[PDB]
Amino acid sequence: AQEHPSLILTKAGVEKIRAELGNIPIFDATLEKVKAEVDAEIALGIDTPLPKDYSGGYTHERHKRNFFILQKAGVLYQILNDEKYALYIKDMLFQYEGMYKDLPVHPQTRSYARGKLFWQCLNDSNWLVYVSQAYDCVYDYLSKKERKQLEKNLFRPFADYISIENPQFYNRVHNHSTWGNAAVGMIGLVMGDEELIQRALYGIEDDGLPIGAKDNDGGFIKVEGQKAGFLANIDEPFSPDGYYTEGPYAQRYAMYPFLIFAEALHNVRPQQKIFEHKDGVLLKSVNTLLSLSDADGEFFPLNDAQKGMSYHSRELVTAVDIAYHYGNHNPQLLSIAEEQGQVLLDDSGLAVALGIREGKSEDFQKKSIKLSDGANGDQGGVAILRYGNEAMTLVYKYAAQGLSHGHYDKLSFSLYEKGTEILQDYGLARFVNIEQKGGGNYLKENTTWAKQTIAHNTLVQNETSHFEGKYEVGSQHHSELYFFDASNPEVQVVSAKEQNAYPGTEMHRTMALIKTDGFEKPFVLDILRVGSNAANQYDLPFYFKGQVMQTNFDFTTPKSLEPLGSDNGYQHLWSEGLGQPKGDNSQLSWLENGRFYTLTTATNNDDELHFVRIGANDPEFNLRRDAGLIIRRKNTKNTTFVSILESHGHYSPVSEFSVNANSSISKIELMLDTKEYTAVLIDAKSNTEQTLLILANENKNVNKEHIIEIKGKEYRWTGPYQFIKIN
Amino acid sequence: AQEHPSLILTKAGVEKIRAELGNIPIFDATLEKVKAEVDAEIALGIDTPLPKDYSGGYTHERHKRNFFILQKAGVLYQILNDEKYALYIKDMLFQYEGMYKDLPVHPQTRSYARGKLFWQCLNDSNWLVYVSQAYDCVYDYLSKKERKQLEKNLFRPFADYISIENPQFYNRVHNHSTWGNAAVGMIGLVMGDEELIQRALYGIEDDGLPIGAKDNDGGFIKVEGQKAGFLANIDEPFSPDGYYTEGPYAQRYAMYPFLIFAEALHNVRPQQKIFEHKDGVLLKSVNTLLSLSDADGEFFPLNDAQKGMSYHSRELVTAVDIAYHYGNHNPQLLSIAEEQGQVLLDDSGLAVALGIREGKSEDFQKKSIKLSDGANGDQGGVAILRYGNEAMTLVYKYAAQGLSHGHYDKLSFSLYEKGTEILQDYGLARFVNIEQKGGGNYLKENTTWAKQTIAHNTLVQNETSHFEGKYEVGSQHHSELYFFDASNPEVQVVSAKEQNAYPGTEMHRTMALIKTDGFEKPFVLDILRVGSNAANQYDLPFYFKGQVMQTNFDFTTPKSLEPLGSDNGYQHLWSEGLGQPKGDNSQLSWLENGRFYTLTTATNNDDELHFVRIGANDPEFNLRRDAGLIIRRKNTKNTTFVSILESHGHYSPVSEFSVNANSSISKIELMLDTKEYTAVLIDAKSNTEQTLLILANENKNVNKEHIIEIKGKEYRWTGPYQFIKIN
Ligand SMILES: O=C(O)C1=C[C@H](O)[C@H](O)[C@H](O[C@H]2[C@H](O)[C@H](O)[C@@H](O)O[C@@H]2C(=O)O)O1
Ligand SMILES: O=C(O)C1=C[C@H](O)[C@H](O)[C@H](O[C@H]2[C@H](O)[C@H](O)[C@@H](O)O[C@@H]2C(=O)O)O1
Ligand SMILES: [Ca+2]
Ligand SMILES: [Ca+2]
Ligand SMILES: [Mg+2]
């Protein structure tokens, strides 16, 4: 009784596509491009080489390309009704059938779960997700005898290999296991194998895995009390805001198996109600992911993330189209599809094409947003403050650990202006799929640099990373939201605390995005309040992008560059210059992509200002030679850092005009600096312009009245903060 | 008798413009933008502050902005027939008249010719060129009494100040003097003052200047026996190919006064035949300058050049429109005008707009080109070799000294792919008009780093710059063309020699851009043959752009960074790693803007391979932290460096696919290495792909027969080289 195809491309979908071909431009353009790709591969023949290589290498790239081409051939067969596509799928499947059973585990030994076609089970699982879709498309074209042999000798052994033979890969809450569960589930659905479908949804019972078993990136395989399978992978790593705990680079990857397998489940097993699971989180998570991109569509590089990954990727084409068709037809998704310029060649892609043709498209709104972390939304979060039409974007990370790929960077932030990074989060130390760089895999410096606290724009105590850079400790902890208030577009404030990163120390960081009179643009205000039980060394880095223009302090230029320290990331920084503050406010200004920036920070006379450059202890040139300025405050117990980051003016090498190149800050001053209250006065060099930010530190309640005095003057307000103009 | 205006905007021009307004989109759009700009400044008022500042500072930027706005107000007055513009010009001129006479020499003392309005006479001259045009536009609106006072108390004294009172500025063959000559000449022509007109054309008679005195940038003020004035500035620093000896950044700046003053001379003194002068060189030089830009229209950064200067600049808007109107109406110039998206608000800009409306536009062809240097084309040259549609561009500099801004860089090259710099020429050390960077003026490191040989991709002998970095030596010498042959678009070759850079050493460098079977793209072949009479240390830098991917040799990574040397630029390089070749060919690959590149060079086992990084002894962060690889060959007399630079493959962080990431070179071998003949064998990996280049070094005659033997086999050809496929 089951029709084929039916999981993703459906028979009713084929009919409708055919009726519309020639009058759906984005679809017609995709079809033509895909037809040319597949026809090219058909001319080259069928190559199924004996495994051997890591990423970037021939056997990896060939087997990878085969999976993409098979899924494309399948939809081409159905849409065009042209058997050359089916014959190619059939021949290729049988060539795999003739080699796969005789293969020995991948000869490369790095993976905690060595694959057969690829170095790791993750890529074997990618292959099966894509190939299942091809099989659904040729299932009726094949004879019963042919299906029986493929299922017995190719598909069933393959599905076992990436599941019951490698439970350490398959049975976790992790993007790996989501790929594995989907692979097993997609082929199960095509075949009507109820055992495999149950294994996909619920995992393996009694896996026998030992205590403390880890993956290659330092993460635990299993967590006590945690379920396995697809449904557990929806329930645990997504918050109620649709925020995926590994961060957006990983979320981007995981959306393919999440949304493909959900779509398949919706079409074949509607009683599962997969698109309702956890209050509709999968569909919601698509809007959330799109909001975690800068003005160019590039995902913010939180935790292990390669820069340049964006919503133009194949996973976001898939996610946008599926969310459009199976969700409530959000017309904002249509504008993303138009930017992508392609669609899936299936029912969901057609629906997007027709939505565009009918003039339904609306601009995707990028707004200030609060995202909770943890399954129940109580394990910290991430906040994005935006000004104007994405004119300025502040990303503040007060999240949980983030699994194996997570960084030791409680309360870090990064800053963007219209697609240009100004203060960065480093991302990963890996050149993804570039064979010549460690087989395209994680490099040693991902651990030694990238993940360490000193690499991030946040507080480092005693040259030690948050939670001593120990996964097993960090994974128990998260920062805590104090408050989020972005209702006033001119004055948006978020605040969070962290008391476990350094036991005996409390960090309370408040960030604001503020437009006020005297300034050409909004500025970022950063208040980092530190309470401790002992005198420590505190470092606060700012990793800035651009060319240094000016400072209001002197600094030394050493004749030779030495590393800043010996451990925990400090071995990777060259000491490029050492300054002493001239007064209460120190300034550093730079030029990046035609715009000037100024960092102003409240300094004491014993502060050290360290110019740094990344690149020490990097024998393979695995790290970028980016710079930073670190404020070091020695022998200090309780302290409050106060900083402003301004954007002003411009420079063009065409006109040779430099405009508004100086700061407009006259003075920043702490007026009150106690446990209960923090008050910062901001004086704008614009003649007469003064503002006062007051924070109540010990009670967040929006209806709580506060009464303080500053120089004999009473200030009275309700709620955790006030911003006032001083006249 | 003389009409006003008539120099640049003419009265028949004004009538034709008014008849066409509203049906000439590029002109209509420009008029609207300029109207809004001038109307804004009129609302702000008239400010003529007491001069104090360097470039980027308030008084410099305000007086500069006034000159641009006055010239815009003048054409607006005429075109729109609206006396608001004329009244603004009058009021501003009278405000200048009230202050100028009482002003003392600019108080900044860092110009060899301090101005009055500005720190230097160069900028006073800019002001007068622009204001002259405005005066022409309001001449009839003013009363005779008003003109008399302006002329007596502002214009005549101004013109004298920048000329007869500062002959050291005014009477040279130099871009400065071209601006000074045009300033005096433009105001002379508006006024009908024969004295000033002659002074402009023919210079100051008996100037009394010392021969051997220097300007602040280290070049000679005056050359014995050399004429002065506008005509001398056309005859002397332009070659017969329209190449301006100072290089394209400076040529760009000089075109404004050259073409503006030439246009005024054409309209007011047609008997001068200015557009025929030196065989039409001024019109020709516009094409030449456009040919000295990369695929994005950015000028190659030869000699003192700021990167990002482009044909979108105000000077090239001006040059393009004038050359179109007064030259032979070359329709290729119309495509540049379309990219610029604006035109001059005058007769020439009208002619461009009409050319575009009538569909005359044709694409500007960027070709391989040989440019001679020196007034008679015998003082070396510059070669540009291009492949395909600016797919790859090699720039080879074998020029004369280049006057004061020239670099010690005989036979250096740079390499570009579709607007991306792959191997660079550093350009200047100066942040043009950015006050915070030493007043926007040349920095100390422009002499200590930028101009030195070690900063360039060319031979350095015994850690010493060409000509010992002395202007008085280098200014007497030039490299010599051996041959240029670009007729075969697959195999283009240029060769030059230099024997005075290091007395007792001969450098013979041959560069080729070669497309052959077995390579996806054209490659650069570089043969640097060196003959000497002592054993020396030879250094060969390659300043590459991008992320290091791979080497075929081991290298050390020191625990601290030390400077590479003590003098002549080596004090600005950190030694970042030291390698020794493993074989006959050493390889370095990198990734830049999505593409891979491989440098392969013939090494002896005693060679040292130095990774370097610019930035030592740079206390104010005036230098970029770019990298290089230096080949160092010690204790060597005669040697030949052979290198290939390939472009291959692609990387995308969206798809995460790395394609064709390895070199296709199997080997390069020197088959013959004598004074008379050089032969280089290139084997591609494809196997069956082998090529041989043979150079005859002591006879360039295209009809001379050569017979040689290599490995027992006879090779016979005519002319200075042969490139043959070995079968
Ligand atoms: O194709 C891939 O192997 C791949 C693509 C994703 O974009 C992402 O880079 C993913 O990283 C893996 C990695 O290959 C290892 O399996 C391990 O470190 O886990 C990573 C992950 O969890 O995403 O790999
Ligand atoms: O506005 C300028 O001062 C200016 C514009 C040109 O683009 C170019 O940069 C030029 O440089 C001058 C410099 O200001 C000094 O006058 C001296 O060093 O000479 C340079 C030159 O001849 O170009 O300045
Ligand atoms: Ca990070
Ligand atoms: Ca140079
Ligand atoms: Mg998961």
Ligand SMILES: [Mg+2]
């Ligand atoms: Mg942004």
Ligand SMILES: [Mg+2]
């Ligand atoms: Mg001035």
Ligand SMILES: [Mg+2]
């Ligand atoms: Mg470029």
